[PDB]
């Protein structure tokens, strides 16, 4: 790849009391043209790990392929649930791929988020892994997962990598991150986490031209990786001044 052609905009991932909540609008743009409006941008790596991306879609699909087969081989050698690769392992692997490609001046034009649960003590999902069946879609309850057992990593084009309690990509690194650094807190419930993520996505919808309001939410919890039903975010303007007719303003001067 020589540069972005088809791109996704921004991803938000945060720890809350039951695991990881990661969000991305389902949009991939061809420049300023919103060609694809129903694109999946958060992928399941294993029952405890997800991958989100911004930037070029082809490079992201390549990386998703790499990780899919890495998880398959991991399962091929597994003899006990502890053998499954952690989110930290996948974050290291992706950071390494990016570093190697930087040294060749052949990078993937992506920013990546690797998030998940860094422990095996909260459930027995990895005792019998199903790749092609999902049982979550039974009446059990989520276990609170200590924040230290949760992992959210970031990788950019140059191989810069780090972990945090909340990670953002793209325009979320300005709009969402400001609100998160002001307002995020530990042990948030699903309701509070969802409310904060939705406020960030609403600001992005109002201020990022590449964004959309059709939001895919993914959760990684004691029940595994769950894709929520995509939903349209209701975004209303926050001032009547915007809606005031221009003809009611003075006709003279630069009144616009």
């Amino acid at each position: 790849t020589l540069g972005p052609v088809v791109t996704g905009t921004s991803v938000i991932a945060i720890k809350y009391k039951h695991g990881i909540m990661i969000a991305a609008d389902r949009k991939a743009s061809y420049g300023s043209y919103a060609k694809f409006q129903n694109v999946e941008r958060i992928f399941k790596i294993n029952n405890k790990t997800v991958m989100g991306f911004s930037g070029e879609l082809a490079d992201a699909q390549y990386l998703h392929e790499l990780l899919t087969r890495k998880n398959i081989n991991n399962l091929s050698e597994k003899k006990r649930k502890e053998d499954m690769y952690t989110p930290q392992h996948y974050h290291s692997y992706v950071s390494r791929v990016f570093y190697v490609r930087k040294n060749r001046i052949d990078p993937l034009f992506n920013n990546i988020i690797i998030a998940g649960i860094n422990s095996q003590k909260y459930d027995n999902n990895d005792d019998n892994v199903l790749l092609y069946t999902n049982k979550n879609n039974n009446n059990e309850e989520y276990k609170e997962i200590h924040k230290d057992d949760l992992y959210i990593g970031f990788v950019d084009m140059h191989g810069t990598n780090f972990c945090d309690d909340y990670i953002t990509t793209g325009y979320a690194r300005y709009f969402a991150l400001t609100l998160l650094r002001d307002h995020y807190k530990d042990n948030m419930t699903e309701e509070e986490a969802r409310i904060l993520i939705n406020e960030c996505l609403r600001i992005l919808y109002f201020r990022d031209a590449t964004s959309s309001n059709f939001i895919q939410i993914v959760k990684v919890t004691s029940k595994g990786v769950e894709y929520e039903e995509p939903y349209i975010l209701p975004c209303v303007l926050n001032s009547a001044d915007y809606v005031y007719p221009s003809t009611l303003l003075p006709p003279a001067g630069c009144m616009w």
């Binding site: 003075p250 003279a252 001067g253 630069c254």
Partner: protein, 124 residues
């Protein structure tokens, strides 16, 4: 000097007789205009009469065209009494002054300031 009543220069007593003669020329037109202010309005009334000048009033003259009231802008009008060439000239000067003001400042000139700017032009 012998020409102190020909140019706009002071005479021995301090008068500029050219200004007095221009005012008399205004008076010679025999045109009367009256402006009156209300509490929330203002009115100007003038005669629809040709200024007494070299030529006289013909019966084929279109009397509807005879006027001494002009719009400067949509919201500012005036009566101009005096020599018709000079009155038309002052009308155009005032219109251009108002338009320049509007463009420069993004709002319409009010009547006071337009009058003062016109008079600054006349002082020259």
């Amino acid at each position: 000097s012998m020409y102190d009543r020909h140019l706009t220069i002071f005479s021995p007593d301090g008068n500029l007789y050219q200004i007095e003669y221009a005012i008399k020329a205004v008076k010679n037109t025999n045109i009367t205009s009256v402006g009156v202010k209300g509490e929330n309005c203002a009115v100007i009334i003038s005669q629809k009469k040709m200024a007494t000048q070299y030529i006289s009033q013909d019966k084929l003259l279109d009397y509807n065209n005879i006027t001494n009231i002009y719009n400067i802008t949509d919201e500012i009008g005036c009566s101009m009494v005096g020599m018709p060439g000079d009155c038309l000239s002052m009308v155009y000067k005032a219109r251009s002054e108002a338009s320049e003001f509007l463009y420069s400042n993004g709002y319409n000139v009010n009547a006071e300031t337009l009058c003062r700017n016109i008079c600054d032009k006349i002082q020259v």
